[PDB]
Nucleic acid binder design. Structure first.
Ligand SMILES: [Fe+3]
Length: 202
DNA sequence: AGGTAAACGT
DNA sequence: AACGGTATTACCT
């Protein structure tokens, strides 16, 4: 019944911290606005994204990249809010990763219908560090697979405040998000947000 | 030699 | 609509 080797779900872990997290998402986005990024192959992603911390994930003509600069504003990504950093540290510790030091937080916003096709997180050079993923707002179905794309999927509803952590043996597992169902949430109104914490540099 | 990118039909 | 083809290649370093 645990998610996977090295992976855990902490249901409602961030529920108490959620209102402050959402205030800080709005602050981050007031500086580096949400944008829907374009893949190298030229398709616009359905998820809108921004980043905070020292490195932000971005698409480019040439591929994917972690960059210290927001290519839309040409300014550094906003500093990682202390509320984000503290929640991440607490969740990582609860999940068995007490030494995790993230330097990058990708903020995803899902409107109805928005999805993330099954992929691997592998843009980070240090594979030893876990990924911490915080869900806020509307619920979504998270796919969590194996090392091969065709490995059987677990499908888990992620609700407001749920935190998922993966690392170690499951660090490179395929995962994704199924198209978001429309709904109402009193804190986010009509969307889902996700915070994904990584150590993207040295 | 390796790593990268991937988001339509059944 | 869950599953899997496609990158079975074309480019970089
Ligand atoms: Fe991911």
């Amino acid at each position: 019944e645990p998610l996977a080797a090295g992976a855990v779900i902490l249901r409602r872990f961030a529920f108490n911290a959620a209102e402050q997290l959402i205030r800080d998402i709005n602050d981050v986005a007031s500086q580096s606005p949400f944008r829907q990024m374009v893949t190298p192959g030229g398709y616009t992603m359905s998820v809108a994204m921004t980043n905070c911390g020292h490195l932000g994930w971005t698409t480019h003509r040439q591929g994917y990249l972690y960059s210290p600069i927001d290519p839309q504003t040409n300014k550094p990504w906003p500093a990682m809010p202390q509320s984000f950093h503290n929640l991440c540290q607490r969740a990582a510790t609860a999940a068995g990763y007490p030494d995790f030091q993230p330097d990058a937080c990708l903020i995803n916003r899902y409107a109805p219908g928005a999805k993330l096709c099954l992929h691997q997180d592998k843009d980070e050079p240090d594979l030893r560090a876990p990924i911490v993923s915080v869900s806020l707002g509307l619920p979504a179905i998270f796919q969590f697979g194996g090392l091969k794309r065709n490995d059987p999927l677990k499908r888990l509803l992620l609700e407001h405040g749920d935190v998922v952590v993966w690392g170690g043996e499951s660090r490179l597992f395929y995962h994704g998000i199924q198209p978001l169902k429309a709904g109402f949430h009193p804190l986010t109104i009509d969307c889902r947000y996700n915070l994904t914490f990584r150590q993207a540099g040295k």
